[PDB]
Write a protein that binds this DNA or RNA. Sequence first.
RNA 1: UUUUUUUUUUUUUUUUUUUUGCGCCGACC
Length: 49
Amino acid sequence: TEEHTHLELMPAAILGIPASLVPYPEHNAAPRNTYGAGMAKQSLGLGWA
RNA sequence: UUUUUUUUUUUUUUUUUUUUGCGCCGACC
């Protein structure tokens, strides 16, 4: 509106890198999202070539 | 013409059968 002084660029960018791995985080409970972000760093895969 | 020292015997071989501690960081239940 006219009263607004700034516009948000990306509301999904307020999360960290591990927290962005969770798909649809707004449909989950906050402790579940915290657990998912925590366990995202404990997974196994091709980390480095 | 002159005194105040004492005396005796009993103990054996060439030598022998496994890192503790200190502190930090991350993480699980």
